Amino acid sequence: VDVVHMDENSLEFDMVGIDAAIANAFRRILLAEVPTMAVEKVLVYNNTS
């Protein structure tokens, strides 16, 4: 693995000698399976906007 650039909120690196199956697995996990916290229920009391 060769890291090109890393700051806050961006990271370019290389993977050398790994297959498209595992590299696409990593890409798909990053897209859709690493969990985060997000607002689900919104309890409004007044909304005159």
Partner: protein, 51 residues
């Protein structure tokens, strides 16, 4: 004032305004054609590929 019948007339004069054509007959003055779309100057590659 007997008002007798006179003879038949010889002919007919007819007076009417004539138009002026010193203006028309000139070379035509059409509406100028809009230019074809030209590429803007100063277009550069803004997107560079990641990594």
């Amino acid at each position: 004032g007997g008002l007798t019948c006179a003879s038949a007339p010889q002919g007919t004069l007819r007076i009417l305004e004539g138009p002026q054509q010193s203006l028309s007959g000139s070379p035509l003055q059409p509406i100028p054609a809009s230019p074809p779309p030209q590429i803007p100057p100063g277009l550069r590659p803004r997107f560079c590929a990641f990594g």
